[PDB]
Amino acid sequence: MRLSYEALEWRTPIENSTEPVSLPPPPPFFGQERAREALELAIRGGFHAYLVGPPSLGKHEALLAYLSTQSVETPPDLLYVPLSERKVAVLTLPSGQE
Amino acid sequence: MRLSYEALEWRTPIENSTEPVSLPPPPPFFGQERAREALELAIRGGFHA
Amino acid sequence: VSLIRPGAVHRAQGGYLILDALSLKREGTWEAFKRALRNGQVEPVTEPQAPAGLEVEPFPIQMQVILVGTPEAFEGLEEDPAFSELFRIRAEFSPTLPASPENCTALGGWLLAQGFQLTQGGLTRLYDEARRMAEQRDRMDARLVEIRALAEEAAVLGGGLLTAESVEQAIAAREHRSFLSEEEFLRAVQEGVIRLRTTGRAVGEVNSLVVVEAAPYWGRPARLTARAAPGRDHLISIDREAGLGGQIFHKAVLTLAGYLRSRYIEHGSLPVTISLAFEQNYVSIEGDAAGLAELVAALSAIGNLPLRQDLAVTGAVDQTGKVLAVGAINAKVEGFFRVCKALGLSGTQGVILPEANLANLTLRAEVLEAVRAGQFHIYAVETAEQALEILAGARMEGFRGLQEKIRAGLEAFARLEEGHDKEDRE
Amino acid sequence: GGQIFHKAVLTLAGYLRSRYIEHGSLPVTISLAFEQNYVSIEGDAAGLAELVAALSAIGNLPLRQDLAVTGAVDQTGKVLAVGAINAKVEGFFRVCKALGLSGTQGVILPEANLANLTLRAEVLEAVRAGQFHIYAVETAEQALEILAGARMEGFRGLQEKIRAGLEAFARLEEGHDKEDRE
Amino acid sequence: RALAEEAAVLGGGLLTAESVEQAIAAREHRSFLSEEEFLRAVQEGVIR
Amino acid sequence: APAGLEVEPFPIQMQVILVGTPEAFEGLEEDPAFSELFRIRAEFSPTLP
């Protein structure tokens, strides 16, 4: 079976090379509904998650962009205190009480 | 078959051994258009090369 | 206490700790991190020459750990059951996105947010190149960093605007920058150092497309040769048995031997031994895949069938006969087209590739233009018999059929083996 | 090397078995060696000289010693390009000149290295005077032509000589089997 | 316990039959990439 | 040293133009991080026309 040009053509046609296009930004993890759903579940549940992806997918940067819009209650001030001269324990106080 | 002298001769003949040669300096990366274009791209874009 | 410094764990509390799984594997700190996650035991690192330390109590862990890494980096961690005990949410990124106008628009918007100035042609060509990198006509590459890098190169080569011409030039220069190996190969082929036959017919020879190592895996032909001589029923694959690699029984020699023994049935054993070899050494053949080129070369060597040298033959084959798809089909096709163009296009050259790879043919503009002009060809074959009937230029049906000629060749070789064994017996 | 199948041995065996089919397993054991070991022979390519010497030993062909044989072969019989052809040609010319050129010394080299030959002035001057000969071969058969001075086609050709050698060794093996059986 | 946690998270502090069904579906779906690509290859004819 | 200094991360404004013989990169191109960082391969042709 000899493949004709029609069967091999895969390049979408072009209407112009000028008149720059304006498009709204896509939602984060566009086309990655699996990753976005998993991250929403992990963030809502506070589970320990892990992103698995081929290198150069920009997993590190969309993770930061998605986590920045996330919001939780104000973190407490954690700090070491000496229970004794040799024993030290980490405790958290309300914000701004350190 | 046997290679004759004419088929083996590769030296470009010298027409004289005098008249000291004066030529303009060649452009950098002469004969290395690939490397020159790659470096020009890397420098203009600031990509590590 | 005042000399205790906070690490990553002590500033990720109430938030998220993002670590590279490859980093944890490399630095050998995964055990300590696992203990910190389970037991809430965080302990500042100490210096070996200081004997007096501080007994740090366990600290309840309020953070969320979101490791990030390639699948291979986690294949070294998922073996530990405690890993699956701790980390239970798998946020897997699909390496490819569906190729649809919705995703094209999303990519355009995403590059616009990056600051690039995209014309419609430029976005279209970036979308096409993303599909090419995914090596699928229906899936675009989800590696948005790669596309961003290509867009940056296009912007530099186009001023500040990603015109279609600019991104085409960027792709062309990306191919041309790492093109020195193929340039040397073509110069060798033209100069006659590496002699490949791209015209006429030859017996037991075929142009098997192989891949050589580089940043882009460059495809190029290699003259596969097959020589059949009477002897034991052993198929000697010289390429993969070279040196100490022959102590492995491979998976391809068995495949071709099974196909040959089961398909042609007129004797209680295969009466031929076939040496399969490659001219030149740049091929790097996988030991577990038996190429269609090897099968057709062996069949031609058996049957004295003159195969066309115009057509390169690629594709994997199993013992049933049907042709399996192979990776990097685009590179192989473009490499054979480059060699044919360097040696001159006779208007009858082509490539024989599996129909299963018909869904991965995203070819460059030049190859498609050559096909449209009829100066090139692309042949899709479903079974090795189709590839053989295409190469030999005759059908397997009736008198002078290909199967009948192969049977005649096997009968002649078995006759010589019979004479040898008859002489040795007395 | 006993536990190694190599790649140059397999190529030579494949060529020898495929080209001469009048019996089954090729009834010869070919021992190939270099006198005066400084060679460090390659393990990834079978030299044309190895094949030609094997054929001469098989068929009792007196090869010319005037002509050195260089080049790598595959099992199709094609002579492939080899690296550093200039060094090999100049080395043989130096050895010929040390013993004195008789005007018939030469080098048999692959056609593929025709675009690879850049020789010193001494070699080119010798070729100009007809004291040194450079032969270019495309297949091992043509190298055997040049060395043996005879063709495969015709009466008392090279093919029938190699056939006679193979048949004689096969007859000796058959006699051994006959002795063993009786 | 982990599945119950996932079901409660998906159901919003309430665990119902629908929530557990959603949790099981999500647990299949988060590791379904390999099968998704295999099915897509079979549909596209790469794996006949 | 008893106590070092916690040096903060610094945004890098330089660009790195590595130079190496090809077998020196054959052992350095195995990292996908190398491909991600160094994207412009300026390769010098060993032979000029």
mmCIF file with all atom_site columns, C-alpha atoms in Angstrom, chain C residues 243-372:
data_model
loop_
_atom_site.group_PDB
_atom_site.id
_atom_site.type_symbol
_atom_site.label_atom_id
_atom_site.label_alt_id
_atom_site.label_comp_id
_atom_site.label_asym_id
_atom_site.label_entity_id
_atom_site.label_seq_id
_atom_site.pdbx_PDB_ins_code
_atom_site.Cartn_x
_atom_site.Cartn_y
_atom_site.Cartn_z
_atom_site.occupancy
_atom_site.B_iso_or_equiv
_atom_site.pdbx_formal_charge
_atom_site.auth_seq_id
_atom_site.auth_comp_id
_atom_site.auth_asym_id
_atom_site.auth_atom_id
_atom_site.pdbx_PDB_model_num
ATOM 1   C CA . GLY C 1 243 ? 32.462 -10.134 21.079 1.00 0.00 ? 243 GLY C CA 1
ATOM 2   C CA . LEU C 1 244 ? 31.080 -11.358 24.399 1.00 0.00 ? 244 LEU C CA 1
ATOM 3   C CA . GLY C 1 245 ? 27.535 -10.284 23.538 1.00 0.00 ? 245 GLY C CA 1
ATOM 4   C CA . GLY C 1 246 ? 26.908 -13.673 21.928 1.00 0.00 ? 246 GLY C CA 1
ATOM 5   C CA . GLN C 1 247 ? 26.528 -15.441 25.268 1.00 0.00 ? 247 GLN C CA 1
ATOM 6   C CA . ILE C 1 248 ? 23.057 -13.872 25.467 1.00 0.00 ? 248 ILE C CA 1
ATOM 7   C CA . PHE C 1 249 ? 20.455 -15.827 23.498 1.00 0.00 ? 249 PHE C CA 1
ATOM 8   C CA . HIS C 1 250 ? 18.685 -12.562 22.498 1.00 0.00 ? 250 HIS C CA 1
ATOM 9   C CA . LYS C 1 251 ? 15.001 -12.468 21.504 1.00 0.00 ? 251 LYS C CA 1
ATOM 10  C CA . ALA C 1 252 ? 15.382 -11.594 17.814 1.00 0.00 ? 252 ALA C CA 1
ATOM 11  C CA . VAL C 1 253 ? 17.395 -14.553 16.535 1.00 0.00 ? 253 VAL C CA 1
ATOM 12  C CA . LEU C 1 254 ? 14.792 -16.862 18.069 1.00 0.00 ? 254 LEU C CA 1
ATOM 13  C CA . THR C 1 255 ? 12.023 -14.799 16.461 1.00 0.00 ? 255 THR C CA 1
ATOM 14  C CA . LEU C 1 256 ? 13.462 -14.988 12.947 1.00 0.00 ? 256 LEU C CA 1
ATOM 15  C CA . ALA C 1 257 ? 14.415 -18.647 13.356 1.00 0.00 ? 257 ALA C CA 1
ATOM 16  C CA . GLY C 1 258 ? 10.887 -19.527 14.444 1.00 0.00 ? 258 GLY C CA 1
ATOM 17  C CA . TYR C 1 259 ? 9.369  -17.591 11.560 1.00 0.00 ? 259 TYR C CA 1
ATOM 18  C CA . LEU C 1 260 ? 11.653 -19.228 8.996  1.00 0.00 ? 260 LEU C CA 1
ATOM 19  C CA . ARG C 1 261 ? 11.246 -22.743 10.392 1.00 0.00 ? 261 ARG C CA 1
ATOM 20  C CA . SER C 1 262 ? 7.459  -22.635 10.749 1.00 0.00 ? 262 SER C CA 1
ATOM 21  C CA . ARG C 1 263 ? 6.693  -20.746 7.540  1.00 0.00 ? 263 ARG C CA 1
ATOM 22  C CA . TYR C 1 264 ? 8.626  -22.905 5.043  1.00 0.00 ? 264 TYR C CA 1
ATOM 23  C CA . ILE C 1 265 ? 7.796  -26.540 5.745  1.00 0.00 ? 265 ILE C CA 1
ATOM 24  C CA . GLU C 1 266 ? 9.369  -29.134 3.445  1.00 0.00 ? 266 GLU C CA 1
ATOM 25  C CA . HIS C 1 267 ? 11.998 -30.535 5.815  1.00 0.00 ? 267 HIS C CA 1
ATOM 26  C CA . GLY C 1 268 ? 12.323 -31.659 9.411  1.00 0.00 ? 268 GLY C CA 1
ATOM 27  C CA . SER C 1 269 ? 14.714 -28.799 10.170 1.00 0.00 ? 269 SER C CA 1
ATOM 28  C CA . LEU C 1 270 ? 15.919 -25.584 8.631  1.00 0.00 ? 270 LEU C CA 1
ATOM 29  C CA . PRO C 1 271 ? 18.520 -26.696 6.048  1.00 0.00 ? 271 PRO C CA 1
ATOM 30  C CA . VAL C 1 272 ? 20.305 -23.320 5.948  1.00 0.00 ? 272 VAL C CA 1
ATOM 31  C CA . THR C 1 273 ? 22.365 -21.161 8.260  1.00 0.00 ? 273 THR C CA 1
ATOM 32  C CA . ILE C 1 274 ? 22.012 -17.449 7.547  1.00 0.00 ? 274 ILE C CA 1
ATOM 33  C CA . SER C 1 275 ? 24.619 -14.889 8.552  1.00 0.00 ? 275 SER C CA 1
ATOM 34  C CA . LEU C 1 276 ? 22.999 -11.471 8.984  1.00 0.00 ? 276 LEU C CA 1
ATOM 35  C CA . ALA C 1 277 ? 25.514 -8.633  9.022  1.00 0.00 ? 277 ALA C CA 1
ATOM 36  C CA . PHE C 1 278 ? 25.729 -4.867  8.672  1.00 0.00 ? 278 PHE C CA 1
ATOM 37  C CA . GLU C 1 279 ? 28.228 -3.021  6.538  1.00 0.00 ? 279 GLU C CA 1
ATOM 38  C CA . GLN C 1 280 ? 29.799 -0.243  8.648  1.00 0.00 ? 280 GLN C CA 1
ATOM 39  C CA . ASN C 1 281 ? 29.551 0.100   12.442 1.00 0.00 ? 281 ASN C CA 1
ATOM 40  C CA . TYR C 1 282 ? 27.266 2.887   13.640 1.00 0.00 ? 282 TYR C CA 1
ATOM 41  C CA . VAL C 1 283 ? 24.069 0.917   13.946 1.00 0.00 ? 283 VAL C CA 1
ATOM 42  C CA . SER C 1 284 ? 23.613 0.017   17.641 1.00 0.00 ? 284 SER C CA 1
ATOM 43  C CA . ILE C 1 285 ? 20.959 -2.669  17.205 1.00 0.00 ? 285 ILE C CA 1
ATOM 44  C CA . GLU C 1 286 ? 18.642 -3.653  20.036 1.00 0.00 ? 286 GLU C CA 1
ATOM 45  C CA . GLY C 1 287 ? 18.941 -7.323  20.907 1.00 0.00 ? 287 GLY C CA 1
ATOM 46  C CA . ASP C 1 288 ? 15.244 -7.866  21.626 1.00 0.00 ? 288 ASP C CA 1
ATOM 47  C CA . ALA C 1 289 ? 13.742 -6.604  18.339 1.00 0.00 ? 289 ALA C CA 1
ATOM 48  C CA . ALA C 1 290 ? 13.984 -8.432  15.012 1.00 0.00 ? 290 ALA C CA 1
ATOM 49  C CA . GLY C 1 291 ? 13.747 -5.952  12.167 1.00 0.00 ? 291 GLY C CA 1
ATOM 50  C CA . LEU C 1 292 ? 11.709 -6.529  9.032  1.00 0.00 ? 292 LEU C CA 1
ATOM 51  C CA . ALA C 1 293 ? 14.870 -5.749  7.083  1.00 0.00 ? 293 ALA C CA 1
ATOM 52  C CA . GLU C 1 294 ? 16.608 -8.788  8.559  1.00 0.00 ? 294 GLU C CA 1
ATOM 53  C CA . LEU C 1 295 ? 13.699 -11.041 7.611  1.00 0.00 ? 295 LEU C CA 1
ATOM 54  C CA . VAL C 1 296 ? 13.452 -9.785  4.028  1.00 0.00 ? 296 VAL C CA 1
ATOM 55  C CA . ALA C 1 297 ? 17.234 -9.930  3.603  1.00 0.00 ? 297 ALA C CA 1
ATOM 56  C CA . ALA C 1 298 ? 17.264 -13.518 4.860  1.00 0.00 ? 298 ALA C CA 1
ATOM 57  C CA . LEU C 1 299 ? 14.412 -14.462 2.529  1.00 0.00 ? 299 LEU C CA 1
ATOM 58  C CA . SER C 1 300 ? 16.176 -12.908 -0.459 1.00 0.00 ? 300 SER C CA 1
ATOM 59  C CA . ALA C 1 301 ? 19.414 -14.693 0.431  1.00 0.00 ? 301 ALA C CA 1
ATOM 60  C CA . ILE C 1 302 ? 17.521 -17.984 0.671  1.00 0.00 ? 302 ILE C CA 1
ATOM 61  C CA . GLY C 1 303 ? 15.615 -17.574 -2.569 1.00 0.00 ? 303 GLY C CA 1
ATOM 62  C CA . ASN C 1 304 ? 18.158 -15.674 -4.688 1.00 0.00 ? 304 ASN C CA 1
ATOM 63  C CA . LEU C 1 305 ? 15.477 -12.995 -4.970 1.00 0.00 ? 305 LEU C CA 1
ATOM 64  C CA . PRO C 1 306 ? 16.761 -9.628  -6.231 1.00 0.00 ? 306 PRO C CA 1
ATOM 65  C CA . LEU C 1 307 ? 15.383 -6.987  -3.876 1.00 0.00 ? 307 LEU C CA 1
ATOM 66  C CA . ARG C 1 308 ? 15.030 -3.373  -4.929 1.00 0.00 ? 308 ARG C CA 1
ATOM 67  C CA . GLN C 1 309 ? 17.683 -1.108  -3.438 1.00 0.00 ? 309 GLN C CA 1
ATOM 68  C CA . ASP C 1 310 ? 15.512 1.968   -4.009 1.00 0.00 ? 310 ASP C CA 1
ATOM 69  C CA . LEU C 1 311 ? 13.372 1.191   -0.969 1.00 0.00 ? 311 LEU C CA 1
ATOM 70  C CA . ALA C 1 312 ? 14.736 1.216   2.550  1.00 0.00 ? 312 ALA C CA 1
ATOM 71  C CA . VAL C 1 313 ? 13.097 -1.345  4.825  1.00 0.00 ? 313 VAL C CA 1
ATOM 72  C CA . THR C 1 314 ? 12.328 -0.642  8.471  1.00 0.00 ? 314 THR C CA 1
ATOM 73  C CA . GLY C 1 315 ? 10.030 -2.124  11.080 1.00 0.00 ? 315 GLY C CA 1
ATOM 74  C CA . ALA C 1 316 ? 10.000 -4.906  13.642 1.00 0.00 ? 316 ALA C CA 1
ATOM 75  C CA . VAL C 1 317 ? 8.539  -8.329  12.893 1.00 0.00 ? 317 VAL C CA 1
ATOM 76  C CA . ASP C 1 318 ? 7.420  -11.187 15.117 1.00 0.00 ? 318 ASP C CA 1
ATOM 77  C CA . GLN C 1 319 ? 7.250  -14.896 14.371 1.00 0.00 ? 319 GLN C CA 1
ATOM 78  C CA . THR C 1 320 ? 3.707  -14.624 13.025 1.00 0.00 ? 320 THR C CA 1
ATOM 79  C CA . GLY C 1 321 ? 4.861  -12.504 10.098 1.00 0.00 ? 321 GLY C CA 1
ATOM 80  C CA . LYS C 1 322 ? 3.059  -9.252  10.824 1.00 0.00 ? 322 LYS C CA 1
ATOM 81  C CA . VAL C 1 323 ? 5.165  -6.093  11.016 1.00 0.00 ? 323 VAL C CA 1
ATOM 82  C CA . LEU C 1 324 ? 5.407  -4.317  14.368 1.00 0.00 ? 324 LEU C CA 1
ATOM 83  C CA . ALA C 1 325 ? 5.802  -0.581  14.781 1.00 0.00 ? 325 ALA C CA 1
ATOM 84  C CA . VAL C 1 326 ? 9.205  0.873   15.659 1.00 0.00 ? 326 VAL C CA 1
ATOM 85  C CA . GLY C 1 327 ? 10.223 4.065   17.393 1.00 0.00 ? 327 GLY C CA 1
ATOM 86  C CA . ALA C 1 328 ? 11.642 7.158   15.723 1.00 0.00 ? 328 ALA C CA 1
ATOM 87  C CA . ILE C 1 329 ? 10.132 6.348   12.342 1.00 0.00 ? 329 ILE C CA 1
ATOM 88  C CA . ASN C 1 330 ? 10.293 10.029  11.354 1.00 0.00 ? 330 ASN C CA 1
ATOM 89  C CA . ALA C 1 331 ? 14.051 10.128  11.877 1.00 0.00 ? 331 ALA C CA 1
ATOM 90  C CA . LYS C 1 332 ? 14.616 6.976   9.822  1.00 0.00 ? 332 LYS C CA 1
ATOM 91  C CA . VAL C 1 333 ? 12.442 8.169   6.938  1.00 0.00 ? 333 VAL C CA 1
ATOM 92  C CA . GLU C 1 334 ? 14.056 11.607  6.868  1.00 0.00 ? 334 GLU C CA 1
ATOM 93  C CA . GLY C 1 335 ? 17.520 10.059  7.035  1.00 0.00 ? 335 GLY C CA 1
ATOM 94  C CA . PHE C 1 336 ? 16.908 7.814   4.063  1.00 0.00 ? 336 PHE C CA 1
ATOM 95  C CA . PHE C 1 337 ? 15.437 10.755  2.171  1.00 0.00 ? 337 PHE C CA 1
ATOM 96  C CA . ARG C 1 338 ? 18.544 12.812  2.927  1.00 0.00 ? 338 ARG C CA 1
ATOM 97  C CA . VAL C 1 339 ? 20.799 10.041  1.641  1.00 0.00 ? 339 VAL C CA 1
ATOM 98  C CA . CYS C 1 340 ? 18.699 9.603   -1.507 1.00 0.00 ? 340 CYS C CA 1
ATOM 99  C CA . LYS C 1 341 ? 18.705 13.348  -2.186 1.00 0.00 ? 341 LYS C CA 1
ATOM 100 C CA . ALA C 1 342 ? 22.475 13.535  -1.684 1.00 0.00 ? 342 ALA C CA 1
ATOM 101 C CA . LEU C 1 343 ? 22.967 10.682  -4.150 1.00 0.00 ? 343 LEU C CA 1
ATOM 102 C CA . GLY C 1 344 ? 20.286 12.094  -6.448 1.00 0.00 ? 344 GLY C CA 1
ATOM 103 C CA . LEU C 1 345 ? 16.591 11.295  -6.646 1.00 0.00 ? 345 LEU C CA 1
ATOM 104 C CA . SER C 1 346 ? 15.716 8.873   -9.431 1.00 0.00 ? 346 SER C CA 1
ATOM 105 C CA . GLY C 1 347 ? 12.011 9.384   -8.752 1.00 0.00 ? 347 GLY C CA 1
ATOM 106 C CA . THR C 1 348 ? 11.485 5.819   -7.581 1.00 0.00 ? 348 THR C CA 1
ATOM 107 C CA . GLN C 1 349 ? 13.144 5.745   -4.168 1.00 0.00 ? 349 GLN C CA 1
ATOM 108 C CA . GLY C 1 350 ? 11.069 5.212   -1.061 1.00 0.00 ? 350 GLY C CA 1
ATOM 109 C CA . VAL C 1 351 ? 10.759 3.689   2.388  1.00 0.00 ? 351 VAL C CA 1
ATOM 110 C CA . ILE C 1 352 ? 8.894  0.578   3.547  1.00 0.00 ? 352 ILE C CA 1
ATOM 111 C CA . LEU C 1 353 ? 7.472  1.255   7.002  1.00 0.00 ? 353 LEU C CA 1
ATOM 112 C CA . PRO C 1 354 ? 4.875  -0.580  9.109  1.00 0.00 ? 354 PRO C CA 1
ATOM 113 C CA . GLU C 1 355 ? 1.254  0.471   8.888  1.00 0.00 ? 355 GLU C CA 1
ATOM 114 C CA . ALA C 1 356 ? 1.249  0.630   12.688 1.00 0.00 ? 356 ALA C CA 1
ATOM 115 C CA . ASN C 1 357 ? 3.641  3.577   12.340 1.00 0.00 ? 357 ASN C CA 1
ATOM 116 C CA . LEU C 1 358 ? 1.242  5.349   9.971  1.00 0.00 ? 358 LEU C CA 1
ATOM 117 C CA . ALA C 1 359 ? -0.022 7.151   13.083 1.00 0.00 ? 359 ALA C CA 1
ATOM 118 C CA . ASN C 1 360 ? 3.485  8.409   13.953 1.00 0.00 ? 360 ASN C CA 1
ATOM 119 C CA . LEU C 1 361 ? 4.480  9.810   10.543 1.00 0.00 ? 361 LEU C CA 1
ATOM 120 C CA . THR C 1 362 ? 4.994  13.503  11.192 1.00 0.00 ? 362 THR C CA 1
ATOM 121 C CA . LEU C 1 363 ? 7.449  14.225  8.384  1.00 0.00 ? 363 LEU C CA 1
ATOM 122 C CA . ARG C 1 364 ? 9.335  17.391  7.530  1.00 0.00 ? 364 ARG C CA 1
ATOM 123 C CA . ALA C 1 365 ? 8.183  19.698  4.751  1.00 0.00 ? 365 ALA C CA 1
ATOM 124 C CA . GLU C 1 366 ? 10.840 18.503  2.300  1.00 0.00 ? 366 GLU C CA 1
ATOM 125 C CA . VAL C 1 367 ? 9.893  14.814  2.477  1.00 0.00 ? 367 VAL C CA 1
ATOM 126 C CA . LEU C 1 368 ? 6.190  15.560  2.023  1.00 0.00 ? 368 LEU C CA 1
ATOM 127 C CA . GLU C 1 369 ? 6.942  17.855  -0.915 1.00 0.00 ? 369 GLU C CA 1
ATOM 128 C CA . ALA C 1 370 ? 9.046  15.112  -2.495 1.00 0.00 ? 370 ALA C CA 1
ATOM 129 C CA . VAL C 1 371 ? 6.233  12.591  -1.996 1.00 0.00 ? 371 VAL C CA 1
ATOM 130 C CA . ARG C 1 372 ? 3.693  14.968  -3.543 1.00 0.00 ? 372 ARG C CA 1
#
